[PDB]
Protein backbone atom coordinates (compact mmCIF):
# COMPACT_ATOMS: atom_id res chain seq x y z
CA UNK A 1 0.00 0.00 0.00
CA UNK A 2 2.02 2.99 -1.37
CA UNK A 3 -0.74 5.65 -0.83
CA UNK A 4 0.41 8.93 0.79
CA UNK A 5 -0.77 10.33 4.10
CA UNK A 6 -2.44 13.73 3.59
CA UNK A 7 -2.55 16.70 6.00
CA UNK A 8 -4.80 19.65 5.12
CA UNK A 9 -3.60 22.38 7.51
CA UNK A 10 -6.27 25.11 7.40
CA UNK A 11 -5.94 28.44 9.25
CA UNK A 12 -8.99 30.58 10.15
CA UNK A 13 -9.09 34.24 8.94
CA UNK A 14 -5.40 34.30 7.90
CA UNK A 15 -4.58 36.93 5.23
CA UNK A 16 -2.08 36.76 2.33
CA UNK A 17 0.45 38.84 4.41
CA UNK A 18 -0.22 37.27 7.89
CA UNK A 19 3.14 35.43 7.70
CA UNK A 20 6.94 36.02 7.48
CA UNK A 21 6.83 34.15 4.11
CA UNK A 22 6.44 36.75 1.31
CA UNK A 23 3.63 35.83 -1.17
CA UNK A 24 4.07 39.25 -2.94
CA UNK A 25 7.05 40.51 -5.05
CA UNK A 26 8.94 41.83 -1.96
CA UNK A 27 8.70 41.76 1.86
CA UNK A 28 5.95 43.93 3.44
CA UNK A 29 6.13 45.49 6.94
CA UNK A 30 3.82 42.56 7.97
CA UNK A 31 6.35 39.96 6.64
CA UNK A 32 9.04 41.66 8.82
CA UNK A 33 6.75 41.82 11.97
CA UNK A 34 5.14 38.33 11.95
CA UNK A 35 7.16 35.11 12.55
CA UNK A 36 6.23 31.87 10.70
CA UNK A 37 9.52 29.96 10.36
CA UNK A 38 7.75 26.60 9.76
CA UNK A 39 5.79 28.12 6.82
CA UNK A 40 9.21 29.16 5.39
CA UNK A 41 10.45 25.55 6.07
CA UNK A 42 7.34 24.15 4.28
CA UNK A 43 7.89 26.49 1.26
CA UNK A 44 11.58 25.41 1.09
CA UNK A 45 10.41 21.75 0.70
CA UNK A 46 7.38 22.44 -1.61
CA UNK A 47 5.42 24.81 -3.86
CA UNK A 48 3.97 28.21 -2.90
CA UNK A 49 0.68 29.24 -4.58
CA UNK A 50 0.69 33.07 -4.94
CA UNK A 51 -2.83 33.37 -6.48
CA UNK A 52 -4.94 30.88 -4.42
CA UNK A 53 -8.58 31.89 -3.78
CA UNK A 54 -11.29 31.14 -1.25
CA UNK A 55 -14.62 32.87 -0.57
CA UNK A 56 -14.46 35.85 1.85
CA UNK A 57 -16.34 34.17 4.79
CA UNK A 58 -15.71 30.81 6.59
CA UNK A 59 -18.96 28.99 5.60
CA UNK A 60 -18.85 29.46 1.79
CA UNK A 61 -15.16 28.43 1.73
CA UNK A 62 -15.45 25.39 4.05
CA UNK A 63 -18.74 24.17 2.43
CA UNK A 64 -16.99 24.52 -1.00
CA UNK A 65 -13.99 22.50 0.34
CA UNK A 66 -16.05 19.57 1.73
CA UNK A 67 -18.55 19.36 -1.22
CA UNK A 68 -16.28 20.49 -4.14
CA UNK A 69 -18.98 22.98 -5.30
CA UNK A 70 -18.74 26.73 -6.04
CA UNK A 71 -20.37 28.89 -3.28
CA UNK A 72 -22.85 30.35 -5.88
CA UNK A 73 -24.19 26.75 -6.30
CA UNK A 74 -24.24 25.53 -2.65
CA UNK A 75 -25.78 28.89 -1.47
CA UNK A 76 -24.08 28.79 1.96
CA UNK A 77 -23.00 32.37 1.17
CA UNK A 78 -22.78 33.81 4.71
CA UNK A 79 -21.65 32.34 8.06
CA UNK A 80 -23.78 29.68 9.82
CA UNK A 81 -24.45 29.05 13.54
CA UNK A 82 -28.11 28.74 14.65
CA UNK A 83 -30.59 26.39 12.97
CA UNK A 84 -33.06 28.14 10.59
CA UNK A 85 -31.49 31.52 11.57
CA UNK A 86 -29.96 33.96 9.01
CA UNK A 87 -26.90 35.75 10.48
CA UNK A 88 -27.34 38.54 7.85
CA UNK A 89 -27.64 42.16 9.07
CA UNK A 90 -30.97 43.73 7.93
CA UNK A 91 -30.64 46.31 5.06
CA UNK A 92 -32.96 49.33 4.29
CA UNK A 93 -33.08 48.55 0.50
CA UNK A 94 -32.45 44.81 -0.12
CA UNK A 95 -33.64 41.49 1.35
CA UNK A 96 -31.15 38.58 1.32
CA UNK A 97 -32.42 35.46 -0.50
CA UNK A 98 -33.56 32.36 1.41
CA UNK A 99 -29.99 30.97 1.32
CA UNK A 100 -28.69 27.65 2.76
CA UNK A 101 -28.18 28.96 6.36
CA UNK A 102 -28.32 25.35 7.74
CA UNK A 103 -25.06 24.71 5.77
CA UNK A 104 -24.22 21.38 4.05
CA UNK A 105 -24.88 17.69 4.81
CA UNK A 106 -24.58 14.31 3.02
CA UNK A 107 -28.34 13.60 3.53
CA UNK A 108 -31.71 14.95 2.38
CA UNK A 109 -34.58 15.96 4.73
CA UNK A 110 -33.57 19.45 6.03
CA UNK A 111 -34.59 22.82 4.51
CA UNK A 112 -31.93 25.43 3.58
CA UNK A 113 -29.18 22.74 3.28
CA UNK A 114 -26.97 21.88 0.30
CA UNK A 115 -26.53 18.07 0.02
CA UNK A 116 -23.17 16.77 -1.19
CA UNK A 117 -20.96 13.67 -1.09
CA UNK A 118 -18.01 14.41 1.26
CA UNK A 119 -14.45 13.86 -0.16
CA UNK A 120 -13.57 12.72 3.43
CA UNK A 121 -16.28 10.01 3.17
CA UNK A 122 -14.69 8.86 -0.13
CA UNK A 123 -11.23 8.79 1.57
CA UNK A 124 -12.61 6.66 4.45
CA UNK A 125 -14.48 4.36 2.01
CA UNK A 126 -11.09 3.84 0.17
CA UNK A 127 -9.44 2.72 3.47
CA UNK A 128 -7.98 6.01 4.86
CA UNK A 129 -8.06 6.62 8.61
CA UNK A 130 -9.68 10.08 8.91
CA UNK A 131 -8.97 12.64 11.68
CA UNK A 132 -10.67 16.03 12.21
CA UNK A 133 -8.95 18.50 14.56
CA UNK A 134 -10.32 21.98 15.36
CA UNK A 135 -12.85 24.15 13.47
CA UNK A 136 -15.55 22.24 11.50
CA UNK A 137 -18.31 24.82 10.79
CA UNK A 138 -20.05 22.75 8.02
CA UNK A 139 -23.64 22.67 9.44
CA UNK A 140 -25.79 24.79 11.76
CA UNK A 141 -26.44 23.63 15.36
CA UNK A 142 -29.03 20.76 15.49
CA UNK A 143 -28.38 19.78 11.80
CA UNK A 144 -26.53 16.56 10.86
CA UNK A 145 -23.59 18.52 9.32
CA UNK A 146 -22.68 19.98 12.79
CA UNK A 147 -20.84 16.70 13.69
CA UNK A 148 -17.49 16.00 11.91
CA UNK A 149 -18.30 12.22 12.10
CA UNK A 150 -21.19 12.94 9.66
CA UNK A 151 -18.52 13.91 7.06
CA UNK A 152 -16.61 10.57 7.26
CA UNK A 153 -14.10 11.54 10.00
CA UNK A 154 -13.43 8.63 12.45
CA UNK A 155 -11.73 10.92 15.02
CA UNK A 156 -13.08 14.33 16.08
CA UNK A 157 -10.94 16.65 18.25
CA UNK A 158 -12.93 19.82 19.19
CA UNK A 159 -15.11 20.12 16.00
CA UNK A 160 -18.80 21.22 16.11
CA UNK A 161 -21.23 23.69 14.41
CA UNK A 162 -19.37 26.79 15.67
CA UNK A 163 -16.95 28.74 13.42
CA UNK A 164 -15.40 30.71 16.30
CA UNK A 165 -14.08 30.07 19.82
CA UNK A 166 -14.99 31.56 23.23
CA UNK A 167 -11.37 31.61 24.54
CA UNK A 168 -7.84 30.50 23.55
CA UNK A 169 -6.92 29.99 27.28
CA UNK A 170 -6.70 26.63 29.13
CA UNK A 171 -7.11 28.65 32.38
CA UNK A 172 -10.60 29.70 31.08
CA UNK A 173 -11.39 26.06 30.02
CA UNK A 174 -11.61 27.37 26.36
CA UNK A 175 -14.92 29.04 27.41
CA UNK A 176 -16.38 26.88 30.24
CA UNK A 177 -16.92 28.09 33.85
CA UNK A 178 -15.47 26.17 36.87
CA UNK A 179 -18.63 23.88 36.82
CA UNK A 180 -17.87 23.00 33.13
CA UNK A 181 -20.86 25.06 31.85
CA UNK A 182 -20.17 26.59 28.40
CA UNK A 183 -19.99 30.45 28.52
CA UNK A 184 -21.27 30.59 24.89
CA UNK A 185 -22.10 28.50 21.78
CA UNK A 186 -18.39 29.08 20.78
CA UNK A 187 -17.03 27.09 23.85
CA UNK A 188 -14.39 24.64 22.46
CA UNK A 189 -15.46 21.03 23.27
CA UNK A 190 -13.37 17.85 23.91
CA UNK A 191 -10.30 19.50 25.59
CA UNK A 192 -11.37 18.80 29.25
CA UNK A 193 -7.87 17.24 29.92
CA UNK A 194 -6.31 20.75 29.43
CA UNK A 195 -8.82 22.71 31.60
CA UNK A 196 -7.05 24.78 34.30
CA UNK A 197 -3.60 24.38 32.62
CA UNK A 198 -1.45 27.09 30.90
CA UNK A 199 -2.13 25.33 27.53
CA UNK A 200 -3.14 27.64 24.61
CA UNK A 201 -5.92 26.05 22.51
CA UNK A 202 -3.54 25.86 19.48
CA UNK A 203 -1.08 23.82 21.61
CA UNK A 204 -3.87 21.55 23.01
CA UNK A 205 -5.11 20.83 19.44
CA UNK A 206 -1.52 20.00 18.34
CA UNK A 207 -0.98 17.63 21.33
CA UNK A 208 -4.33 15.87 20.61
CA UNK A 209 -3.49 15.67 16.83
CA UNK A 210 -0.09 14.06 17.66
CA UNK A 211 -1.85 11.51 19.98
CA UNK A 212 -4.22 10.73 17.04
CA UNK A 213 -1.24 10.38 14.61
CA UNK A 214 0.54 7.95 17.02
CA UNK A 215 -2.75 5.90 16.92
CA UNK A 216 -2.85 6.29 13.08
CA UNK A 217 0.62 4.70 12.79
CA UNK A 218 -0.60 1.65 14.83
CA UNK A 219 -3.65 1.20 12.53
CA UNK A 220 -1.60 0.25 9.37
CA UNK A 221 -3.67 2.66 7.18
CA UNK A 222 -2.87 5.84 5.24
CA UNK A 223 -4.23 8.80 7.26
CA UNK A 224 -5.97 12.04 6.35
CA UNK A 225 -5.68 14.77 9.00
CA UNK A 226 -7.73 17.97 8.68
CA UNK A 227 -5.79 20.26 11.02
CA UNK A 228 -8.28 23.11 11.08
CA UNK A 229 -7.00 25.83 13.45
CA UNK A 230 -9.37 28.01 15.51
CA UNK A 231 -6.46 30.51 15.25
CA UNK A 232 -6.37 33.29 14.16
CA UNK A 233 -10.09 34.17 14.77
CA UNK A 234 -11.21 36.87 17.26
CA UNK A 235 -11.38 37.25 20.18
CA UNK A 236 -7.64 38.24 20.18
CA UNK A 237 -6.33 36.48 23.31
CA UNK A 238 -2.56 36.88 23.75
CA UNK A 239 -0.28 33.80 23.87
CA UNK A 240 2.18 34.65 26.68
CA UNK A 241 4.75 32.28 25.00
CA UNK A 242 5.30 34.96 22.26
CA UNK A 243 3.65 38.28 23.34
CA UNK A 244 6.49 40.41 24.87
CA UNK A 245 8.73 40.51 21.76
CA UNK A 246 5.90 41.93 19.55
CA UNK A 247 5.42 44.82 22.05
CA UNK A 248 9.22 45.51 21.64
CA UNK A 249 8.59 45.71 17.83
CA UNK A 250 6.22 48.67 18.57
CA UNK A 251 2.97 46.73 17.86
CA UNK A 252 -0.30 47.72 19.65
CA UNK A 253 -1.76 45.38 22.33
CA UNK A 254 -4.27 43.92 19.79
CA UNK A 255 -1.71 43.67 16.92
CA UNK A 256 0.89 41.99 19.25
CA UNK A 257 -1.85 39.51 20.41
CA UNK A 258 -2.67 38.87 16.69
CA UNK A 259 1.04 38.19 15.99
CA UNK A 260 1.10 35.64 18.90
CA UNK A 261 -1.88 33.73 17.31
CA UNK A 262 0.10 33.58 14.01
CA UNK A 263 3.29 32.37 15.71
CA UNK A 264 1.41 29.65 17.68
CA UNK A 265 -0.32 28.48 14.46
CA UNK A 266 3.18 28.23 12.90
CA UNK A 267 4.49 26.24 15.93
CA UNK A 268 1.60 23.75 15.41
CA UNK A 269 2.67 23.33 11.73
CA UNK A 270 6.29 22.80 12.85
CA UNK A 271 5.27 20.26 15.55
CA UNK A 272 3.38 18.17 12.92
CA UNK A 273 6.36 18.39 10.47
CA UNK A 274 8.68 17.30 13.35
CA UNK A 275 6.36 14.32 14.11
CA UNK A 276 6.41 13.24 10.41
CA UNK A 277 10.27 13.42 10.36
CA UNK A 278 10.72 11.52 13.69
CA UNK A 279 8.06 8.83 12.81
CA UNK A 280 9.49 8.09 9.30
CA UNK A 281 6.23 9.33 7.64
CA UNK A 282 7.68 12.58 6.12
CA UNK A 283 8.75 10.97 2.74
CA UNK A 284 5.18 9.64 2.13
CA UNK A 285 3.05 12.57 3.49
CA UNK A 286 1.47 15.46 1.53
CA UNK A 287 1.02 18.75 3.44
CA UNK A 288 -1.42 21.34 2.08
CA UNK A 289 -1.40 24.71 3.88
CA UNK A 290 -4.40 26.99 3.31
CA UNK A 291 -6.58 29.70 4.92
CA UNK A 292 -10.41 29.96 4.62
CA UNK A 293 -10.71 33.78 3.96
CA UNK A 294 -8.75 37.05 4.19
CA UNK A 295 -7.49 38.81 7.33
CA UNK A 296 -10.11 40.73 9.36
CA UNK A 297 -9.86 44.39 8.17
CA UNK A 298 -13.37 45.90 8.83
CA UNK A 299 -13.59 45.86 12.73
CA UNK A 300 -11.73 48.67 14.59
CA UNK A 301 -12.79 46.87 17.86
CA UNK A 302 -10.04 44.24 17.13
CA UNK A 303 -7.70 45.76 14.44
CA UNK A 304 -5.71 49.00 15.06
CA UNK A 305 -4.27 50.07 11.64
CA UNK A 306 -6.22 52.20 9.09
CA UNK A 307 -9.39 50.10 8.44
CA UNK A 308 -9.50 47.96 5.25
CA UNK A 309 -5.62 47.84 4.93
CA UNK A 310 -4.74 44.80 7.19
CA UNK A 311 -3.91 42.68 4.04
CA UNK A 312 -1.88 45.43 2.23
CA UNK A 313 -0.93 45.55 -0.58
CA UNK A 314 -4.33 43.84 -1.12
CA UNK A 315 -7.50 45.95 -0.59
CA UNK A 316 -9.97 45.20 2.26
CA UNK A 317 -10.23 41.84 4.06
CA UNK A 318 -12.62 39.22 5.45
CA UNK A 319 -16.13 39.63 3.95
CA UNK A 320 -14.78 41.45 0.82
CA UNK A 321 -14.78 40.21 -2.80
CA UNK A 322 -11.61 42.40 -3.12
CA UNK A 323 -8.30 40.41 -3.15
CA UNK A 324 -7.81 41.16 0.61
CA UNK A 325 -10.88 38.99 1.43
CA UNK A 326 -10.30 36.05 -1.00
CA UNK A 327 -6.52 35.64 -1.77
CA UNK A 328 -4.99 33.10 0.67
CA UNK A 329 -1.52 31.90 1.66
CA UNK A 330 -1.22 28.37 0.21
CA UNK A 331 1.71 25.89 0.17
CA UNK A 332 1.86 22.21 -0.94
CA UNK A 333 4.68 19.81 0.06
CA UNK A 334 4.89 16.33 -1.53
CA UNK A 335 8.41 14.93 -1.32
CA UNK A 336 9.61 13.35 -4.60
CA UNK A 337 6.52 14.64 -6.53
CA UNK A 338 6.43 18.47 -6.02
CA UNK A 339 9.68 20.40 -6.77
CA UNK A 340 11.08 21.98 -3.56
CA UNK A 341 11.22 25.82 -3.44
CA UNK A 342 8.84 26.12 -6.45
CA UNK A 343 6.18 28.84 -7.01
CA UNK A 344 2.89 28.73 -8.97
CA UNK A 345 0.93 31.97 -9.76
CA UNK A 346 -1.87 30.20 -11.75
CA UNK A 347 -5.20 30.92 -10.03
CA UNK A 348 -7.41 28.28 -8.34
CA UNK A 349 -10.45 28.16 -6.00
CA UNK A 350 -10.99 26.20 -2.75
CA UNK A 351 -13.46 23.73 -4.40
CA UNK A 352 -10.44 22.53 -6.48
CA UNK A 353 -9.11 20.93 -3.24
CA UNK A 354 -11.86 18.23 -3.38
CA UNK A 355 -10.85 16.48 -6.67
CA UNK A 356 -7.12 17.19 -6.02
CA UNK A 357 -7.12 15.39 -2.61
CA UNK A 358 -9.01 12.38 -4.06
CA UNK A 359 -6.42 12.23 -6.93
CA UNK A 360 -3.57 12.39 -4.36
CA UNK A 361 -5.26 9.41 -2.55
CA UNK A 362 -5.29 7.36 -5.83
CA UNK A 363 -9.14 7.45 -6.05
CA UNK A 364 -9.53 7.56 -9.87
CA UNK A 365 -13.28 6.61 -9.92
CA UNK A 366 -15.86 8.01 -7.45
CA UNK A 367 -19.64 8.64 -7.36
CA UNK A 368 -21.04 11.97 -6.04
CA UNK A 369 -24.68 13.10 -5.70
CA UNK A 370 -23.71 16.71 -6.65
CA UNK A 371 -21.81 18.09 -9.65
CA UNK A 372 -18.13 18.81 -8.77
CA UNK A 373 -17.17 22.40 -9.73
CA UNK A 374 -13.60 21.85 -8.46
CA UNK A 375 -10.82 21.25 -11.03
CA UNK A 376 -7.77 19.20 -9.86
CA UNK A 377 -4.55 21.31 -9.51
CA UNK A 378 -2.45 18.12 -9.77
CA UNK A 379 -1.07 19.50 -13.10
CA UNK A 380 0.11 22.74 -11.32
CA UNK A 381 1.80 20.57 -8.64
CA UNK A 382 3.59 18.44 -11.33
CA UNK A 383 4.29 21.55 -13.58
CA UNK A 384 2.72 19.71 -16.61
CA UNK A 385 -0.26 21.97 -17.60
CA UNK A 386 -2.43 24.91 -16.35
CA UNK A 387 -5.88 23.31 -15.75
CA UNK A 388 -7.30 26.89 -15.24
CA UNK A 389 -6.20 27.96 -18.82
CA UNK A 390 -9.10 30.13 -20.12
CA UNK A 391 -10.99 29.37 -16.84
CA UNK A 392 -13.33 31.91 -15.18
CA UNK A 393 -13.55 31.97 -11.34
CA UNK A 394 -16.85 33.06 -9.73
CA UNK A 395 -17.93 34.51 -6.36
CA UNK A 396 -21.50 35.24 -5.18
CA UNK A 397 -22.28 37.13 -1.92
CA UNK A 398 -25.98 38.14 -2.11
CA UNK A 399 -25.73 38.60 1.66
CA UNK A 400 -25.13 41.22 4.36
CA UNK A 401 -22.19 40.62 6.70
CA UNK A 402 -21.97 42.34 10.13
CA UNK A 403 -19.60 45.07 8.80
CA UNK A 404 -19.45 47.48 5.83
CA UNK A 405 -16.32 48.10 3.77
CA UNK A 406 -14.73 48.12 0.30
CA UNK A 407 -16.05 45.14 -1.73
CA UNK A 408 -18.19 43.86 1.23
CA UNK A 409 -21.90 42.80 0.87
CA UNK A 410 -24.49 42.28 -1.89
CA UNK A 411 -22.12 41.58 -4.79
CA UNK A 412 -20.84 38.91 -7.18
CA UNK A 413 -17.66 38.74 -9.26
CA UNK A 414 -15.83 36.98 -12.08
CA UNK A 415 -12.06 36.64 -12.52
CA UNK A 416 -10.87 35.72 -16.05
CA UNK A 417 -7.20 36.14 -16.99
CA UNK A 418 -5.88 39.55 -15.77
CA UNK A 419 -9.45 40.97 -15.37
CA UNK A 420 -11.86 40.99 -12.42
CA UNK A 421 -15.44 42.37 -12.64
CA UNK A 422 -17.33 43.03 -9.35
CA UNK A 423 -21.10 43.72 -9.69
CA UNK A 424 -23.06 45.40 -6.83
CA UNK A 425 -26.65 44.05 -6.80
CA UNK A 426 -28.19 47.12 -5.06
CA UNK A 427 -26.74 49.99 -7.17
CA UNK A 428 -25.95 48.09 -10.42
CA UNK A 429 -22.36 49.44 -10.11
CA UNK A 430 -19.62 47.52 -11.99
CA UNK A 431 -15.94 47.75 -10.96
CA UNK A 432 -13.28 46.40 -13.36
CA UNK A 433 -9.70 45.78 -12.07
CA UNK A 434 -6.56 44.56 -13.87
CA UNK A 435 -5.21 42.46 -10.94
CA UNK A 436 -1.54 42.09 -12.06
CA UNK A 437 -1.36 45.85 -12.92
CA UNK A 438 -3.35 46.92 -9.80
CA UNK A 439 -3.14 44.26 -7.02
CA UNK A 440 -4.70 46.75 -4.51
CA UNK A 441 -7.82 47.30 -6.74
CA UNK A 442 -7.41 51.12 -6.53
CA UNK A 443 -8.09 51.90 -10.26
CA UNK A 444 -11.65 51.06 -11.52
CA UNK A 445 -11.21 50.71 -15.34
CA UNK A 446 -14.94 49.96 -16.08
CA UNK A 447 -15.47 53.30 -17.97
CA UNK A 448 -12.23 52.76 -20.02
CA UNK A 449 -13.07 49.14 -21.10
CA UNK A 450 -16.84 48.84 -21.75
CA UNK A 451 -16.27 45.78 -24.07
CA UNK A 452 -14.50 43.88 -21.21
CA UNK A 453 -17.30 44.92 -18.78
CA UNK A 454 -19.97 43.60 -21.32
CA UNK A 455 -18.08 40.28 -21.94
CA UNK A 456 -17.50 39.59 -18.21
CA UNK A 457 -21.10 40.70 -17.28
CA UNK A 458 -22.48 38.05 -19.73
CA UNK A 459 -20.06 35.37 -18.36
CA UNK A 460 -21.07 36.24 -14.73
CA UNK A 461 -24.87 36.36 -15.34
CA UNK A 462 -24.78 33.17 -17.49
CA UNK A 463 -22.84 31.25 -14.78
CA UNK A 464 -25.03 32.44 -11.86
CA UNK A 465 -28.22 31.38 -13.75
CA UNK A 466 -26.61 28.03 -14.83
CA UNK A 467 -25.93 27.04 -11.15
CA UNK A 468 -29.33 28.42 -9.90
CA UNK A 469 -27.41 31.04 -7.83
CA UNK A 470 -29.37 33.46 -5.61
CA UNK A 471 -29.67 37.25 -5.68
CA UNK A 472 -31.07 39.79 -3.24
CA UNK A 473 -34.56 41.30 -3.71
CA UNK A 474 -35.48 45.02 -3.70
CA UNK A 475 -37.74 45.52 -0.59
CA UNK A 476 -39.79 48.21 -2.48
CA UNK A 477 -40.80 45.89 -5.41
CA UNK A 478 -40.26 42.24 -4.24
CA UNK A 479 -38.39 41.88 -7.60
CA UNK A 480 -34.92 40.31 -7.59
CA UNK A 481 -31.95 42.64 -8.31
CA UNK A 482 -31.04 42.42 -12.03
CA UNK A 483 -28.34 39.93 -13.12
CA UNK A 484 -25.23 41.88 -14.30
CA UNK A 485 -26.00 41.11 -18.02
CA UNK A 486 -29.63 42.45 -17.57
CA UNK A 487 -28.06 45.91 -16.78
Ligand SMILES: O=S(=O)(O)O[C@@H]1[C@H](O)[C@@H](O)[C@H](O)O[C@@H]1CO
Nearest residue numbers: 013057058059079162163164402
Ligand atom coordinates in the same frame (compact mmCIF):
# COMPACT_ATOMS: atom_id res chain seq x y z
O1 LIG B 1 -16.87 31.69 10.69
S1 LIG B 1 -16.33 32.97 10.26
O2 LIG B 1 -16.98 33.52 9.10
O3 LIG B 1 -14.88 32.95 10.15
O4 LIG B 1 -16.63 33.99 11.45
C1 LIG B 1 -18.04 34.30 11.76
C2 LIG B 1 -18.28 35.77 11.45
O5 LIG B 1 -17.79 36.10 10.15
C3 LIG B 1 -17.58 36.64 12.45
O6 LIG B 1 -17.94 38.00 12.21
C4 LIG B 1 -17.91 36.23 13.87
O7 LIG B 1 -17.20 36.98 14.78
O8 LIG B 1 -17.56 34.85 14.07
C5 LIG B 1 -18.33 33.98 13.23
C6 LIG B 1 -17.97 32.57 13.61
O9 LIG B 1 -18.54 31.64 12.70
Ligand SMILES: [Ca+2]
Nearest residue numbers: 012013058292
Ligand atom coordinates in the same frame (compact mmCIF):
# COMPACT_ATOMS: atom_id res chain seq x y z
CA1 LIG C 1 -12.63 32.28 8.52
